[PDB]
Enzyme design. Sequence first.
Site, mmCIF file in Angstrom:
data_model
loop_
_atom_site.group_PDB
_atom_site.id
_atom_site.type_symbol
_atom_site.label_atom_id
_atom_site.label_comp_id
_atom_site.label_asym_id
_atom_site.label_seq_id
_atom_site.Cartn_x
_atom_site.Cartn_y
_atom_site.Cartn_z
ATOM 1 N N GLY A 30 0.773 -1.231 0.000
ATOM 2 C CA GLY A 30 0.000 0.000 0.000
ATOM 3 C C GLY A 30 0.810 1.290 0.000
ATOM 4 O O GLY A 30 2.044 1.297 0.136
ATOM 5 N N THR A 31 0.091 2.394 -0.171
ATOM 6 C CA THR A 31 0.608 3.746 -0.065
ATOM 7 C C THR A 31 1.347 4.040 1.240
ATOM 8 O O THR A 31 1.073 3.442 2.285
ATOM 9 C CB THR A 31 -0.573 4.674 -0.138
ATOM 10 N N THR A 32 2.290 4.964 1.191
ATOM 11 C CA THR A 32 3.088 5.208 2.372
ATOM 12 C C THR A 32 2.445 6.284 3.224
ATOM 13 O O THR A 32 1.803 7.209 2.724
ATOM 14 C CB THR A 32 4.622 5.375 2.080
#
Lengths: 140, 233
Positions: A30-32
């Site tokens: 996923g996105t950070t």
Amino acid sequence: GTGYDLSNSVFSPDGRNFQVEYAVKAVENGTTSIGIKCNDGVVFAVEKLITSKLLVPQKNVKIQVVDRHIGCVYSGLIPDGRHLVNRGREEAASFKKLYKTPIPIPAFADRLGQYVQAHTLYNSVRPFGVSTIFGGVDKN
Amino acid sequence: TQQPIVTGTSVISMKYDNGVIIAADNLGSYGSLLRFNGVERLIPVGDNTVVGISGDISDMQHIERLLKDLVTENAYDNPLADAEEALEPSYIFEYLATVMYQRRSKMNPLWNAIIVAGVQSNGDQFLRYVNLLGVTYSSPTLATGFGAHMANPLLRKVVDRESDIPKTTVQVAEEAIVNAMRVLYYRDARSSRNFSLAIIDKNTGLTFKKNLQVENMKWDFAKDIKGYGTQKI
């Protein structure tokens, strides 16, 4: 034998729960997102990939508020994060209802913790596909 | 089915040309014992709505907590919480009205008379009543319990039909309200001298006045009254 990884509450011979480990892969994918504690508060930030010009900017908000004083942000399966935040909201309402004071952050942490752990106890549920960073200011 | 124990007397209210006024004294009665003196019975929600409640105080405190909860809840996943998607008085009213009616329908009422006073987002004045039966109505003036008997007739002299609303200034309105509180203090045995008043104005926003007092009372003539008929001294 094998097959230890096919079912949620199952201990592998080395004592691991593989499904939880796979949930962690969904998170890594996923996105950070980050949180930074400061000398009188906390800051949360997240990366929002723009898949196309078509996404209205500022509009698909990812950070969520719990109660009035808690912020949450998560990376992974987003709907899972929402579910977890819904529960966090019930859980904080309940605490405020009975004790009058808004829920302390460590108390709140544990509420989420116990609920997430609950979802590694049985094979009729899948574990959560998120890591959640969350925090706030309380009485101390 | 219940019976009220700690109670608040009248809530009175009217609309003027730009907004609405609503007032209630600071007393919590326990039967005929004037028990509690610091009791705020005007509940502001956001900065465009004040909910004024009479009847059972324990129930009022419950409704108070419901209203805090509505604010919390409307703010969730809502980036326009303090703008286009803030709580309107009509939303707050229709919610309470729903609650009050469901509660009577389960034969377990919130033992209250409530007036929701505010200004809508398009500037329109909002004034509606709901009580323990779930009965609702609007009128240019609205008062509960005792006030419906003694305040309404005074307030109606000022605003008597819709067309009187644009003619009425905040000065004229607040005066009418303040006078009505004095009358109620003269004749309602369950009333207090101390009261709060709030104005919700489409220009000035919300003014919340605390610790008001009925002033300018006529008692002098009392000295000339002796006996109950024939007594001279």
